UniProtKB/Swiss-Prot annotation, chains A, B, C, D, E, F, G, H:
This is Granulin. InterPro entries: Polyhedrin. It comes from the Viruses. Component of the virus occlusion bodies, which are large proteinaceous structures, that protect the virus from the outside environment for extended periods until they are ingested by insect larvae. One of its GO terms (molecular function) is structural molecule activity. Belongs to the polyhedrin family. The lineage of its organism: Viruses, Viruses incertae sedis, Naldaviricetes, Lefavirales, Baculoviridae. One of its GO terms (cellular component) is viral occlusion body. The keyword NADP does not apply.
Amino acid sequence: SLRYSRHDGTSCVIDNHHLKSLGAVLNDVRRKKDRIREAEYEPIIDIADQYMVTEDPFRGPGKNVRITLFKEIRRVHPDTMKLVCNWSGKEFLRETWTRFISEEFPITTDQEIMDLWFELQLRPMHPNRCYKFTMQYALGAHPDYVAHDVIRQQDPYYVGPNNIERINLSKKGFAFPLTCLQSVYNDNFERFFDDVLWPYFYRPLVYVGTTSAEIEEIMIEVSLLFKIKEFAPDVPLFTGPAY
Amino acid sequence: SLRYSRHDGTSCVIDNHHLKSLGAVLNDVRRKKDRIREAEYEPIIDIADQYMVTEDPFRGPGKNVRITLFKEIRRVHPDTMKLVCNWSGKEFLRETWTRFISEEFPITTDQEIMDLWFELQLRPMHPNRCYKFTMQYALGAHPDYVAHDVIRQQDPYYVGPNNIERINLSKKGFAFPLTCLQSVYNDNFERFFDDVLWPYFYRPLVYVGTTSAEIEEIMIEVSLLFKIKEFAPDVPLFTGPAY
Amino acid sequence: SLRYSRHDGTSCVIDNHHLKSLGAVLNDVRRKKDRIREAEYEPIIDIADQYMVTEDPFRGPGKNVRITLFKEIRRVHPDTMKLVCNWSGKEFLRETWTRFISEEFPITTDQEIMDLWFELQLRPMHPNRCYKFTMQYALGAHPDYVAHDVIRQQDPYYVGPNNIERINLSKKGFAFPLTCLQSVYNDNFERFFDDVLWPYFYRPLVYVGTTSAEIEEIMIEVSLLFKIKEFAPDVPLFTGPAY
Amino acid sequence: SLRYSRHDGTSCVIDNHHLKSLGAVLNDVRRKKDRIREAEYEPIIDIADQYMVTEDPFRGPGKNVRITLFKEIRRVHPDTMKLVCNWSGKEFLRETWTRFISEEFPITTDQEIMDLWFELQLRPMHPNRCYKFTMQYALGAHPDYVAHDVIRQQDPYYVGPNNIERINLSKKGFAFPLTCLQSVYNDNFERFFDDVLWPYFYRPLVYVGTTSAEIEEIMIEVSLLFKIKEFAPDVPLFTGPAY
Amino acid sequence: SLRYSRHDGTSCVIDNHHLKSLGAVLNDVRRKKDRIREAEYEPIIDIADQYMVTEDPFRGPGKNVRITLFKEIRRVHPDTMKLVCNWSGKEFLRETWTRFISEEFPITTDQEIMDLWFELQLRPMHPNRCYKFTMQYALGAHPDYVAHDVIRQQDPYYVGPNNIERINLSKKGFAFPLTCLQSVYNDNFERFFDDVLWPYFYRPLVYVGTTSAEIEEIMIEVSLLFKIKEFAPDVPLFTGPAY
Amino acid sequence: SLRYSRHDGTSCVIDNHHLKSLGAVLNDVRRKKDRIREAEYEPIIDIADQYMVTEDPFRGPGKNVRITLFKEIRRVHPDTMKLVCNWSGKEFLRETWTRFISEEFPITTDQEIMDLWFELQLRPMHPNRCYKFTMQYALGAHPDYVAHDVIRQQDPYYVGPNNIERINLSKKGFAFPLTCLQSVYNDNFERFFDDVLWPYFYRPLVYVGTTSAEIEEIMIEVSLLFKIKEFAPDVPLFTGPAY
Amino acid sequence: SLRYSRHDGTSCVIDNHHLKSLGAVLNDVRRKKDRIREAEYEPIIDIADQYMVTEDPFRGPGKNVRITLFKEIRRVHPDTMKLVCNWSGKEFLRETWTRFISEEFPITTDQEIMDLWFELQLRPMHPNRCYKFTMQYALGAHPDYVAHDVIRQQDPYYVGPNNIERINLSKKGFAFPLTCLQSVYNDNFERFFDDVLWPYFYRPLVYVGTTSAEIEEIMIEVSLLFKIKEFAPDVPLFTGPAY
Amino acid sequence: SLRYSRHDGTSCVIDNHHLKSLGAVLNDVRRKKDRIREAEYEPIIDIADQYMVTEDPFRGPGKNVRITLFKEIRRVHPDTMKLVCNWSGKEFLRETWTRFISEEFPITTDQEIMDLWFELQLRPMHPNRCYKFTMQYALGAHPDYVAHDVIRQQDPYYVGPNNIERINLSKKGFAFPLTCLQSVYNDNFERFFDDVLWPYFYRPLVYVGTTSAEIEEIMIEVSLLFKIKEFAPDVPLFTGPAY
């Protein structure tokens, strides 16, 4: 914070003559100089404004609901990656529906799920090390295909500086408990499962490795992160009967 | 613009000896220095070239066709947002088809609609204020669901510095008068409406608010913005009969 | 002027994701840096705000009324100054009252004279010279004292860069046609002269010289400059009868 | 001083061709760059020229006549101030008239006293100390009121870096030996004293302290400083009879 | 241009005290700093003033008279140069005398030709290219020697940035219509030709090429450029008879 | 001058260990940094070394002998130039030979005149002016041609910052008292004059003006400046007889 | 050399949207800034373009042919110079013609000698010294004049940083084996010598010294350097008979 | 290395006039500026030259003889240090004498050992770690005192960036095979041991730890480093008999 904001100095009148604080005046002069500079480089901004960047989805619009699923420890040999999860499509859906609904109910507002993200959080288990994390994934396979427990590293995703990676699970393939802007109805897992077309095909299969030249031990927390927008009316909640 | 471009100075020969303008020579020296600097930082550009930005869709390729729909005035209480539009899916389609086709005909070239954007333009109605605009939306709902006229603000979209927000309406869900690269055929709204699978489900429901701590009055102009690429042959138009 | 003001760039939404112009973002970053700098030096402004400067009386509040009196040419030997004016107190008052009143009538608003200034404007009469002007004055003398036509220079006032010097004539000694905030009454010079206590004592006696080592020729325009504040009611002027 | 002023380098003609010193040419180029810079910041000067500062009265116009009156040593306890002088109004006038007239006669030119200043000069009496001086004053009191010899410090004047403080004694209250632009007449103290209206009321009562946390010993020299403008005619002094 | 030149700010007197514009004062301070800097580097200028540069003959003293002779188009293979002109000495003299005299008459003032220059102006004939021009020449040969139409490039002159090359034709070898400071007499080509000693030997033989690796097409304008100094008396022209 | 040159600091040995002055060490570090910088910009020097400048002939090799001829005062109207000298060729030669030989004899060494220069020195006659000088000349004319006393200014030479202009008088046309590297022989003006081929044709005719918009008064000193190289043997001068 | 030249980054299209490398974009922004800077200082270049510099004759147009003549060792006392060569004019011509012709034949192309230079190359004979070289010369003398073997130093030429000095030998006085643009004819020294007008007068007489305060030992290599331009036709050389 | 050293550019003479490379001239100017800067800060060097630093003993005078003794692996718990060596004084002397003498013989020159250093070299045994080394030591103890194998860390020595620590073993306490400047005599360990006064008391007892919060594995190489100065005469080695 600041002390006087941009309201520094003051003024007074002596014998009709107007006095103003010297520091305030020097700020007016410095700001004029800055304004000229601002004009000087506006043409360069217009070249830059030919392009755009994307706002961070998690610091950006919508609220974050982190439905943590499980934790696991893996040791990973250099240049390899170990499988994090091997659920069937049915089991992933049971966890997705059950964990989200039980945590969120009662759902008291109209709302829409904007996005569903698979979140990997990675932490080292030993101090005084120096390495980074790597990641690979697939989003589907023949239901009788069982993923290899360990693979060799080949052009992986490099996990960001905060050791968190989030994979967007699109509306196609991956089913949501709440499809559109709606109010909740009586719902159950059997009804939900039956309305999914390809329940057994889509399932996240995620691998994790390091850039280390020695074995490392890793702690892993897996969550589903829901981006939700609510449409709450600007009205009171009353104890019944109202009025 | 410049005066001499990069063609400054000149040269001449006196007694076999070659004279050159001093300023031109000093520019050759300064440019050598710059070229060394350019080489010095090329390795840093290569690190930056590991990433990319997206070109602004509206200053970028394709032409812009702005089909303005209507204007409205709303007053918005602090920390709330008021509904801009509540059309049914059928009514949105009537306006989308009718307004686009009547404005654009005769369509005399092969062309494809790249994108359809919903544009909100926001202007204050009073001078000497200081606030920014906010926005929220949904793209569909049960046809018997009527949106709340006013909601409370919760993690909204912040409207950009130019007080314009544009929401992309994808080819899925939202139907286009011209689907692919094609030449226009005899067409009418009833034919068009009948070929849409879910006419009543998809409709933009958009809200608008401010960051003000007092009521503000807003003027709102809503348009549909079409990005179009034309494939006009490099041939003459003749008065009939040709040749 | 600027082109886009501080409203550069724009924003848009694609698949729920918020895009913003790169140049706008880079401006947000640069402005954060500047804001930190502003905080860093606010303590230095507070030291400076222990002192004040005076607003220029002529670019500042009140309007300027320049009642030009006369012009004269003088040649001035090096290290000397020549007398500009030698009026008696009575003659100065006749010119002050007569010239101001005739030029300003009809005076249709309530107003007060804030200040009366004696203005010397100095211009050279030859090109390709290089010198500055000097000034000395007295504001009164025994009425039988006649000022020397020419004096030697001794610690004079140095005239400012614009070759204009203005000497404030205070309310004490020098009488004003309008004393306080008032509406004009029937007035005449004999009434005015009779109400002045010491009409013959106060008179500006002004000298002018140069910093040149040769004789120079000077053109001189002398004016009385009145600072006036008006209190005009916020009402219409009607043709009689009103309403 | 400089060596060649701004007259560096030279020129010559060989076979009709004009040669000029390289250093002179490089100065022409550098000065062009500076001239552009000067234009670039002229708008900022105009913002600054909305305000004014006051020229130092003692380095500025008029000559300085320092009529030293007396010296004194005082020891001052921390957070207190000791009285410098306790003259009656009559005694101050005797010293002011007598000391000025005896020192200045013969007064051989027409002149006017612009201002009368009371000057305090303060010097430490011990080496290897570190403190600043403070000052307070009053300009009048009931003639039977005797000032306290020592007071506590409360929001004093802080003496400037050169350990000199000068207090302006205005024409109102404090009488001058020479009122206006005049030539000296036969004059005496009794005539002078009788023409003063309130001789016993106005007298400078001045206190002095330090910012030290220990007792300090101070040497004090008190003077009256007269600002005078002379109007000496540009004529010879001859031995009589002239011509 | 500037707005106030170096005459910014102003001054005024209030109660004997001299006020000056703050911006003007800050300029005085900044200029003092610059003056110190100027003194600091004057010793470096003196080292530079040990050497000299030559003033551009065409922007410099004397007037320019451009007697254009002809235009031509040539296509030039890479690493070769094509002959621009192959006149005999007699034909060059006929063109030089005839074109200069007919264009300049009536010659009404005393004047001297300072220098005669052969000017090549080179322009590309296609857009979207990137190359520079080259030049070679000889100033004489046995009159029965016919120059090769095309030669290979070997250490040529590189034409300056403005695509103009000018070759000085000295007073020795190349004859002038006006030798010295003179008034024109009755003159004719046969008289002129007869007074030249070696009319058939001296003739400009000029070649032109490029730095391109492909054939390029060039447009060429050839002129004779005369540097002339006139000695026009400071007298009126009258209609006869005078006075 | 410097104090310690580049021999700062010192060294000593304590218990076999070598100590060196810290400032000397810091200079070694700073000089390493500078040496890297020197290498970094050597490629830029090589681009600059493609061109050359000419050493000032008067600060450069050979000694200067200034044979002053005469002084004159001229007043010059704006945009005109007045003739400085109108000698015939014979009279110029008499002054050149006579003044040089009488001043230089006895000539006791073998020597050669490198160059002969006509020097104009220009000084203003009034203070507090601001203008520059201009120059024009011719080096020959029909002996019966008398130059106009005053001409209008048209593309003149601009005199250098030091108000000195020097025109080279070449070996062709203008005859020297000493042609080549030689020892003086018995010589006289009649012998000298007879060996000149065109004594009456070559004579400097020089004009002088200003950039002033008013008449200016000028003082002019004209000299002949001789550049001479001596070949003095490294031997003693003895009183005769030697040894 | 560079790695990617100015072709860094790339572009691609995803869902109609155009992506571009971030580093490429940042370069576009930086180059815009530079372009503004370039415009800002173009007015300063125009002041500099009022003057010109001369291209180095040896790095510039024409080829270099270095006809080395001889080497010599001289020891030079401080403040003196020793004679390098004392050939008669005839002997200099024999060496000039003979050495050039024998080295260059067969001369198979049309060519012209642009310039003839006398080259002094100077090298020290001892390590760990610190001095510079000096030079003086004369280009002619009475044929019976024998130059002093050693002279005292007086305003000499200072040899350049590379310890090479080159003196231009003009077409006047010094005769060339090939005068103009010509093809070689049968030629011999007696024919050549007979066509020279003053064979015995012109001869380079060159001296060499140092800036050392002790005797120094010097190694000296003397060459004649010929600047030649060739006019080689763009045609094949065939074995006879052609075609 | 550099390309032209500080011998850039060149010089030449045309028509008596001296030309010099522009880049060389610009270097002369830049070096003048630097020389002024050098003078400007020489007073600051003199303040710095009040203090001294010590030359690195191993990069400094004398040669280095590294007599490696042994290697060892230790694992070290956090905040502890493990003993590197526990030799008795007798065993340390046997290794010191035996290893030095056997490696160095034949010793063929007069020489003196300046210093004896105990060197610890430390390397990690695992990759992807991040820690520093610590060290403690004692130089003597009662011969029946056996050092603890492991101690806790308390204010240790921090090993330098290169993971090498060297402890000086002074001439007092620690005996040298060669005491002073001498030539080798017949010598043996029993003679050597008998001349040491306190053979059993002095022995290096050295500990090693880390700054790690986990166990680390370390590889350790221990050497004795001898600083030696040789006095080799400047004479030939001959095969016997000499001459």
